[PDB]
Amino acid sequence: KRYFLMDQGDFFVHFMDLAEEELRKPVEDITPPRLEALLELALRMSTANTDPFKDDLKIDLMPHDLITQLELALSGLEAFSFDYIVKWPLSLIINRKALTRYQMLFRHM
Amino acid sequence: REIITLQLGQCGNQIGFEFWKQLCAEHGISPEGIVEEFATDRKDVFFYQADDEHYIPRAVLLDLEPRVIHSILNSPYAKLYNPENIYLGNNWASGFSQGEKIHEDIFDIIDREADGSDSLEGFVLCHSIAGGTGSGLGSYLLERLNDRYPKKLVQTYSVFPNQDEDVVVQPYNSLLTLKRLTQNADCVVVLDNTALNRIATDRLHIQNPSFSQINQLVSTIMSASTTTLRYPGYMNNDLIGLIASLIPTPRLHFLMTGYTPLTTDKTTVLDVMRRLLQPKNVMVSTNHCYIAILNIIQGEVDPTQVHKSLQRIRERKLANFIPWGPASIQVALSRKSPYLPSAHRVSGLMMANHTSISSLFERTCRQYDKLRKREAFLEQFRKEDMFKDNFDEMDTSREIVQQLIDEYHAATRPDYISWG
Amino acid sequence: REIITLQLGQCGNQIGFEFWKQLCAEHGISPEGIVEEFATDRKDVFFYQADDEHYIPRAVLLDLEPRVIHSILNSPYAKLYNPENIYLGNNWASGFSQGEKIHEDIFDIIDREADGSDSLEGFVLCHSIAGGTGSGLGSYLLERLNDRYPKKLVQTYSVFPNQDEDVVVQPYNSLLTLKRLTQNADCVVVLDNTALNRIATDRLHIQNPSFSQINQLVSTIMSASTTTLRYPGYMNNDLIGLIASLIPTPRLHFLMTGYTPLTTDKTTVLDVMRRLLQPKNVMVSTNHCYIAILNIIQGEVDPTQVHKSLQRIRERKLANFIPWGPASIQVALSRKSPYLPSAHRVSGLMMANHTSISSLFERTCRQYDKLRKREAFLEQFRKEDMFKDNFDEMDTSREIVQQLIDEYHAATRPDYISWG
């Protein structure tokens, strides 16, 4: 909830301010480990740097953009998402059928 | 993005010290500078930090006629308020000339923090507008920030001449400083002195000795005004946004205030906001309007009732604001303040751009006209006279706040469709 | 290999005292240098071995025109180092030329220390930059070390007595040191007492005591800079393994300094690199950037974090390196030499070379430029004269420092492909 549903807005007034100028480039023009290391940096000064499972946050990319619901160059803001790893105890709850909607909700927000 | 406090003058430091004392109640910070044993919240938004947990105030204390800070450098909280810098008239141009000779030191001090601070947000000035060196030095510093750091919003929380008007050079002081507010400040979240003090006599017996007791209440006004910066929440985590929805143009930049269990000696959000929306609790005193409302609540209450409450204000028409274009009511549930105990288990504050504030500037202008038509308190002191050898900045100071009166009247009606 | 440590001059010896007693206390070492506490790092960088387990510190105390030294003689650390070497003016050229006057009396130490050796690497000189004994003799002595040991490194682990610089010959003096300590020396490190004095007020209000007080921070800087040599590590095993990485030509080899928990009375490695990149923690005092940096890390830190934190500093772009080449930074890790009082368990130090911090040498030479047209303190006392009467050698020393400063300010240009 603090990350996808974004209730810890403290996190993003750093994170996107760091990552924005990297995200002005189109898709396939991005450096993903550079982005990942920018995550785990806003997530240092932010209040978010207190949670035992904060390390499960991954930067991923959606193609198709908010046009998703039934050109490629406009990207960054149009293409960005978070993800979480899961384990067999909790995967029976928090798997992709849920997280794909957490991403869609995050994307709009 | 982290906030540069910029408090100056005696009263600004009296409210500032009490505000830092209140923040050290609302956050788990020891009097001895360090983390308090007690200790999900971010402190560096307001406090400087060395790695040994010294969560120091970003204070920029200043004086010219030494009376205040050596009387503050005696409490156990002195291990917090090490800014390193504690640098040393009551009338405008004489106060301005004792200022302005101090220039490189202030520039070096603020550069040292603007360079060492991680991500610069904006300068939170707190000082007299009535008099002292505030008349003078205060207007002088507000003639430098504009050129020093042009790409940030120069806020003020500065405190206004409202004391029945010895400090009889207050009308000239107020006019000249109010020009520097209107032309040079980027926001003015003003409060007006005895309009609080006379609400202090309403709540308790403080007939006269309450100026120091205003400092308690305004410290809650300051700490309330920063609630959703200091604790996690979905939106408005920042200075610029807390002002950006409420100030429409670079001219109409003043903001008004109000507090809920101000009678601090459970109900739903409708009760607290119905009480709060009474101009009895707006502590500053043609049918004028707001521009926008921001009012912030903390407590155990759920958010579901804030929408219901907006329908009840919308149907009541209890307070009304027609700016020429709409700029809305904005209200939010937020985390209750930690470490300190608190009564009134759900509570909050309003701020809104109440154009009726024009009446205070008009009272100021009336007092200036009634002293300017007799001219007893010119003093004829040589850096009061020849420092302003043709009086033109006194003379135009009236009309430029009159443009704020007039732009408020025009913006309050289907007009103001042009600049100038 | 092995290192010889020389402390010299009456001013400088007050520091060299504290340095050697810290070096003792950092190990399992008794005041007499006999067996104590814990061994498993190697002592034989600095502690030569007597026939019967007295850990002979390869350490020497030297002076000129003695006064304080009776305290030093009877102090228990005289039992620790005693190769029977303990010997007993105050302006630069007199201090240089009286160093020459005593030359054969003092030199008999140097070769005995060097014969009690397998493989000597270099000589430390814990000299005082403003003093005639502190750096007149301190300039002279390492010039004899060049003339007798031209291939063994002098390490100038100095102190700078800046309190608005009183010594009336200070600019003239330390200018001629900026010939002998640059052109007639192999490497240099300097600690600045204005920055350490401001740091002293940042704990107790230590503003006057300074000297009497600061020596603890001083001594924890010196010992930490050499446990990295003694601790059996993959690299930095010897003195050139410190000096080789951060100097583009050996005259601007004056390293500035830094240390994090200065005021103290888990953290991560990101703390020390960010916190010690703060301009308020620049422990020395128009567009400029670093040449190169050291950033020693100490303590039980996770060794995985050191590469990743460097990537995060690369993203933050705080690391203003030089306008040419791959110049970059190594996070040098050691166990602090443990079981000394371990405040701020994981802690760090910034020995560095920075083009703006040539200010410590150009301020000196700007102050010399202030005095050289006055003839003010070229006062030609009967040994201050006979080094060189006309002080065309001082004018030569000035043009050598104008090369020193223009080499820093040409290192500030992309083309090192022409002379600095």
UniProtKB/Swiss-Prot annotation, chain A:
It is found in: Cytoplasm, Cytoskeleton, Microtubule organizing center, Centrosome. Ubiquitously expressed. Component of the gamma-tubulin ring complex (gTuRC) which mediates microtubule nucleation. The gTuRC regulates the minus-end nucleation of alpha-beta tubulin heterodimers that grow into microtubule protafilaments, a critical step in centrosome duplication and spindle formation. Plays a role in neuronal migration. Belongs to the TUBGCP family. It is linked to Cortical dysplasia, complex, with other brain malformations 15: An autosomal recessive disorder characterized by global developmental delay, variably impaired intellectual development, speech delay, facial dysmorphism, microcephaly, and varying degrees of cortical malformations including pachygyria, thin corpus callosum and subcortical band heterotopia. Most patients have generalized seizures. Component of the gamma-tubulin ring complex (gTuRC) consisting of TUBGCP2, TUBGCP3, TUBGCP4, TUBGCP5 and TUBGCP6 and gamma-tubulin TUBG1 or TUBG2. TUBGCP2, TUBGCP3, TUBGCP4, TUBGCP5 and TUBGCP6 assemble in a 5:5:2:1:1 stoichiometry; each is associated with a gamma-tubulin, thereby arranging 14 gamma-tubulins in a helical manner. Gamma-tubulin at the first position is blocked by TUBGCP3 at the last position, allowing 13 protafilaments to grow into a microtubule. This is Gamma-tubulin complex component 2. It comes from Homo sapiens (Human). The chain holds residues 517 to 645 of 902 of the full protein.
UniProtKB/Swiss-Prot annotation, chains B, C:
GO terms for biological process: cytoplasmic microtubule organization; meiotic spindle organization; microtubule cytoskeleton organization; microtubule nucleation; mitotic cell cycle; mitotic sister chromatid segregation; mitotic spindle organization. It is linked to Cortical dysplasia, complex, with other brain malformations 4: A disorder of aberrant neuronal migration and disturbed axonal guidance. Clinical features include early-onset seizures, microcephaly, spastic tetraplegia, and various malformations of cortical development, such as agyria, posterior or frontal pachygyria, thick cortex, and subcortical band heterotopia and thin corpus callosum in some patients. Gene3D superfamilies: Helix hairpin bin (1.10.287.600), Tubulin/FtsZ, C-terminal domain (3.30.1330.20), Tubulin/FtsZ, GTPase domain (3.40.50.1440). It comes from Homo sapiens. This is Tubulin gamma-1 chain. Component of the gamma-tubulin ring complex (gTuRC) consisting of TUBGCP2, TUBGCP3, TUBGCP4, TUBGCP5 and TUBGCP6 and gamma-tubulin TUBG1 or TUBG2. TUBGCP2, TUBGCP3, TUBGCP4, TUBGCP5 and TUBGCP6 assemble in a 5:5:2:1:1 stoichiometry; each is associated with a gamma-tubulin, thereby arranging 14 gamma-tubulins in a helical manner. Gamma-tubulin at the first position is blocked by TUBGCP3 at the last position, allowing 13 protafilaments to grow into a microtubule. GO terms for cellular component: apical part of cell; cell leading edge; centriole; centrosome; ciliary basal body; condensed nuclear chromosome; cytoplasm; cytoplasmic microtubule. GTP binds at A130, G131, G132, T133, G134, S135, G136. Tubulin is the major constituent of microtubules, protein filaments consisting of alpha- and beta-tubulin heterodimers. Gamma-tubulin is a key component of the gamma-tubulin ring complex (gTuRC) which mediates microtubule nucleation. The gTuRC regulates the minus-end nucleation of alpha-beta tubulin heterodimers that grow into microtubule protafilaments, a critical step in centrosome duplication and spindle formation. Keywords: Cytoplasm, Cytoskeleton, Disease variant, GTP-binding, Lissencephaly, Microtubule, Nucleotide-binding, Phosphoprotein. The modification Phosphoserine is found at S119. GO terms for molecular function: GTP binding; identical protein binding; microtubule nucleator activity; structural constituent of cytoskeleton. The gene is TUBG1. It comes from the Eukaryota. The keyword DNA-binding does not apply. Belongs to the tubulin family.
